[PDB]
Amino acid sequence: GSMAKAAAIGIDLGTTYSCVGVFQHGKVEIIANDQGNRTTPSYVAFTDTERLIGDAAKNQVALNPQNTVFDAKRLIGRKFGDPVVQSDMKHWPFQVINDGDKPKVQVSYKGETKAFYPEEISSMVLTKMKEIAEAYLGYPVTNAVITVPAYFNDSQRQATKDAGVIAGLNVLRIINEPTAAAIAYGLDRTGKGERNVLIFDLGGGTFDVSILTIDDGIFEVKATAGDTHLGGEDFDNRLVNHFVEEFKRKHKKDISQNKRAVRRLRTACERAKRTLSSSTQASLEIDSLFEGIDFYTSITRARFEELCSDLFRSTLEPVEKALRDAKLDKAQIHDLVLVGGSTRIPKVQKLLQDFFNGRDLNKSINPDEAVAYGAAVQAAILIKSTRAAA
Ligand SMILES: Nc1ncnc2c1nc(Br)n2[C@@H]1O[C@H](CO)[C@@H](O)[C@H]1O
Ligand SMILES: [Mg+2]
């Protein structure tokens, strides 16, 4: 009669990390990749012999910075002359070239110089997310919902669809990331009446606040605000500067000019930062960090909180701005939703909860997974083809 239909997938195509989910048996499964990771780095690396995507690309970045591409989402659908592009290029070790006022990333790959459009790099990330899903489902996947930031314009949305098409995916719909996080919590399934929802999205490099109004399952974006210069990497930087100073005090040595030592320090700082979200202190243990000196130390959650105190407080400025733009008072927000791994920081949670006079934060769906979760819920809804009974 009618053959069983393959599941459709939800993909959060993130700036730094991507995530894939599938809605089956009345629930979402966020799919781990073959290294056991529930999120995959949005990285693509090029060598003389291979094209590596995800963890394999990020894990070899230290010695191949010129040919390992990341942050293509910051270039997608933008003109080469866009001031955002021009500023971002100064921070990237890979080459960005001008092709008819359209940026392309240029690398050494399989014996040649090759340039790729941002949508081609994103299609490579989407191919890896599709393969992650197919390894779990055990059959080919065709249909997907892909998410984008609410502030993406028509060109940025079309370039994201183009990336899905290059990857061999049928793009069911491009949906906003804050909308997908709200869908993950069923905030569009609460019946008749208006609900005001604030999405608090703190990423690796950027911070976004969105205010949505939901009325009978219909979403309206009421206000967006944020800080392009606020993310998890800024907290890592504060710990790096702190430990560089500590090594100077303790051993009378400045490590800051050995890239390997700085990199090993930063990698350790990011893990210590994650431990501090669950524990009140964390050890830092690096063997032969510089001049054969073992660096065995610790940091309390209180000291880390003091180090990033101004940065954590600054998340409340875009919250207040978004509320003024939406013409709403904080008491009028019905639901608060946390998105991004950096939102696990207890002090970040406390500052926001205190701002909203003790209100509960929706954080039960892993914040680095909520967007893919909502996208998977929507993908299953979009492929339904029920014919009405008489
Ligand atoms: N448990 C956690 N506590 C604090 N931070 C975290 C945690 N988990 C993740 Br993931 N992060 C950070 O989220 C960002 C995602 O690009 C990176 O800066 C990660 O370091
Ligand atoms: Mg995100």
Which CATH number belongs to the domain containing residue 83 in this structure? 3.30.30.30
Tokens 């009974």 sit on residue: 389
**Do residues 150 and 256 both lie within one domain?**
no
Per the CB < 8 A criterion, the answer to whether 343 and 136 are in contact is no
**Do residues 198 and 60 both lie within one domain?**
no
Per the CB < 8 A criterion, the answer to whether 239 and 207 are in contact is no
Catalytic residues: 12, 73, 177, 201
Tally Cβ neighbours within 10 Å of residue 48.
10
**Do residues 176 and 115 both lie within one domain?**
no
Residue 17 CB–ligand 1 contact under 6 Å: yes
Give how many domains the chain has, as a whole number: 4
DSSP code of 190? S
The conformational region for residue 142 under phi > 0 = left, psi -120 to 50 = alpha, else beta, is: alpha
Give the distance (Å) from ligand 2 centre to CA of residue 122: 15
Residue 274 CB–ligand 1 contact under 6 Å: yes
Of the candidates 328, 321, 276, which has an alpha carbon nearest to the alpha carbon of residue 300?
Answer: 276
**Do residues 175 and 36 both lie within one domain?**
yes
CB-based contacts of 314: which residues, under 8 Å, 6+ apart?
Answer: 227, 230
**Do residues 221 and 241 both lie within one domain?**
no
Per the CB < 8 A criterion, the answer to whether 96 and 107 are in contact is no
Per the CB < 8 A criterion, the answer to whether 166 and 119 are in contact is yes
Task: Output the six-digit token pair for 111.
Answer: 């014996």
Name the residue range of residue 65's domain.
1-69+125-189+363-383
**Do residues 81 and 118 both lie within one domain?**
yes
Tally Cβ neighbours within 10 Å of residue 116.
19
The type of residue at 22 is V
Residue 17 Cα: closest atom of ligand 1: 16
CA distance readout (Å), 367 to 19, 158, 186, 297: 11, 27, 15, 30
Give the distance (Å) from ligand 2 centre to CA of residue 171: 19
Per the CB < 8 A criterion, the answer to whether 10 and 17 are in contact is no
C-alpha span between 300 and 352 (Å, rounded):
22
C-alpha span between 121 and 105 (Å, rounded):
9
Sign of CA dihedral 199, 232, 280, 354: negative
**What angle, 0 to 180 degrees and rounded to 10, lies between the N-to-C axes of helices 316-325 and 346-355?**
40
Residue 235 CB–ligand 1 contact under 6 Å: no
C-alpha span between 375 and 125 (Å, rounded):
17
Give the distance (Å) from ligand 1 centre to CA of residue 203: 8
**Do residues 309 and 322 both lie within one domain?**
no
CB-based contacts of 367: which residues, under 8 Å, 6+ apart?
Answer: 338, 339, 340, 341, 343, 344
Residue 273 Cα: closest atom of ligand 1: 4
CB-based contacts of 1: which residues, under 8 Å, 6+ apart?
Answer: none
**Do residues 178 and 38 both lie within one domain?**
yes
Q: Is 196 inside any structural domain?
A: yes
**Do residues 245 and 305 both lie within one domain?**
yes
Q: Is 297 helix (H, G, I), strand (E, B) or coil?
A: strand
Per the CB < 8 A criterion, the answer to whether 268 and 247 are in contact is no
Task: Output the six-digit token pair for 344.
Answer: 């696990």
Per the CB < 8 A criterion, the answer to whether 378 and 3 are in contact is no
**CATH number of the domain that 174 lies in?**
3.30.420.40
Torsion angles phi and psi, residue 159, rounded to 5: -65, -30
CA distance readout (Å), 306 to 5, 38, 95, 165, 282: 53, 31, 37, 47, 15
**Do residues 47 and 77 both lie within one domain?**
no
Of the candidates 341, 339, 17, which has an alpha carbon nearest to the alpha carbon of residue 177?
Answer: 339
**What angle, 0 to 180 degrees and rounded to 10, lies between the N-to-C axes of helices 259-275 and 232-251?**
120
Strand partners, 202: 207
CB-based contacts of 206: which residues, under 8 Å, 6+ apart?
Answer: 15, 226, 227, 228, 229, 230, 231
The type of residue at 7 is A
Residue 116 CB–ligand 1 contact under 6 Å: no
Per the CB < 8 A criterion, the answer to whether 188 and 219 are in contact is yes
Tokens 């009345």 sit on residue: 26
Q: Is 165 inside any structural domain?
A: yes
Query: Where does 107-231 have alpha helices with state H?
Result: 118-137, 154-166, 177-184
Binding residues for ATP: 14-17, 73, 204-206, 270-277, 341-344
C-alpha span between 160 and 381 (Å, rounded):
21
Q: Which helix (H) or strand (E) holds 293?
A: strand 293-300
Give the distance (Å) from ligand 2 centre to CA of residue 371: 7
Residue 203 CB–ligand 1 contact under 6 Å: yes
Q: Is 388 inside any structural domain?
A: no
Per the CB < 8 A criterion, the answer to whether 188 and 175 are in contact is no
